[PDB]
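Deviation from plan, reported transparently: p-coumaroyl-CoA complex.
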Amino acid sequence: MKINIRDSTMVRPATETPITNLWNSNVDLVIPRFHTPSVYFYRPTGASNFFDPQVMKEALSKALVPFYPMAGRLKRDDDGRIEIDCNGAGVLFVVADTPSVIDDFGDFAPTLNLRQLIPEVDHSAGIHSFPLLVLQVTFFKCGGASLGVGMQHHAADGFSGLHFINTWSDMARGLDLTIPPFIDRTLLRARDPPQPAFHHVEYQPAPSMKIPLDPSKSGPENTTVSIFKLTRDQLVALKAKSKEDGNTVSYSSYEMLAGHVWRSVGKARGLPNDQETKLYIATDGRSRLRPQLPPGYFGNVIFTATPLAVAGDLLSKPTWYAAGQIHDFLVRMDDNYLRSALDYLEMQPDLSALVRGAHTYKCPNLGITSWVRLPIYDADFGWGRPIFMGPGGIPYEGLSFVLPSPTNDGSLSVAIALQSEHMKLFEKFLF
Ligand SMILES: CC(C)(COP(=O)(O)OP(=O)(O)OC[C@H]1O[C@@H](n2cnc3c(N)ncnc32)[C@H](O)[C@@H]1OP(=O)(O)O)[C@@H](O)C(=O)NCCC(=O)NCCSC(=O)/C=C/c1ccc(O)cc1
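Because the crystal trials were delayed, the predicted structure below was used instead.
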């Protein structure tokens, strides 16, 4: 899998954008320290026109006017707090070629030679050097191309990120902005003074293994990334179930699915009865914060639900028990709880310390991020919607994504990184 960079360009906003510093809220700070990798794959239309770099770059430049912070840089304020320096410095746009064909990627598992479709950032050099957004269009010998996205998560969550990407693809089709970015994270400013109302389990350290894992089995070595498809039908049966073993309470499709994955993972890993496993579920607070956020709110509004169970219970009890634990946390996360969370974060002396990076997600724990509602397939640059869109490679073991069907259809895909031996067993999944 060899990549030949053809051309590299620092694209700037088409016109003068505001020169300003953009404050980060507590949840723009407690985010991963890296560029979130995502990848789109497109079949060729057969037209010579296909993904014309000039069309792409002119559109990019246009989109970087309403979404100008995306073209800025990181800097710290006088208190060492990370903020966005909106200096319109720009976004990296790379074009590459490869002798490989798209079909080499087979099923499109986020293995991380898929990371080669995204330009790599050399982190430091400084905090202020590397651009917030990197982009690579890669032309395959088969005629198709990929779009690789690397987005510094301080700029935005996947929700605002997609807002920008889709807006970009729109402008490439001569269309204009639809919902303008609303740019002001101070709506998530903590209350003054901070008064937490809950004990927030989502910010407490993850359970470690009672018996220390074999390092020759648990490194990034011997960590495998795979994908699996549920049909629907299996998704129909999965949600029901639920009535299993006399149980009367009806849980939601996500809840039953996430519990099933969670449970399937524990079985695959052979967790002993007394072992605790913590599940990390990324939750969007746009819909829950009850003063109610503007459409096109530009930033991070991701909170975290973390149900916990002893494996003895999780794996021996029916799947609706796992779904129950999940539901029990998800339902507690109303505006009041979220506001409590912001105030809790406000009282911590260093938010960088609360950033999960697995350790957090390593065995015996797990993260399930669902993109099922994200408009991940709307990025049509003029040559059609992507045949696939997924995480640009899963770094940590124990991290997993739920992807919606490109065709649609009511099938889902689960993309997961597990220890290699554990991965073969993870087919408690279709079980
Ligand atoms: C997982 C949640 C918490 C719930 O999902 P669900 O259970 O499947 O929800 P459903 O779709 O089944 O049903 C939701 C509906 O339930 C309804 N509901 C409410 N309570 C009830 C009730 N008590 N009874 C029955 N119905 C009810 C409620 O109205 C709600 O409606 P609505 O919210 O308007 O769709 C979901 O809302 C959520 O918070 N998702 C988080 C978004 C997410 O997964 N993001 C992934 C980010 S990963 C990342 O780092 C991104 C990096 C990235 C960066 C840049 C990029 O370009 C790309 C990626």
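The domain at 1-205 is CATH 3.30.559.10 (Chloramphenicol Acetyltransferase). We consider this an acceptable substitute for the interim report.
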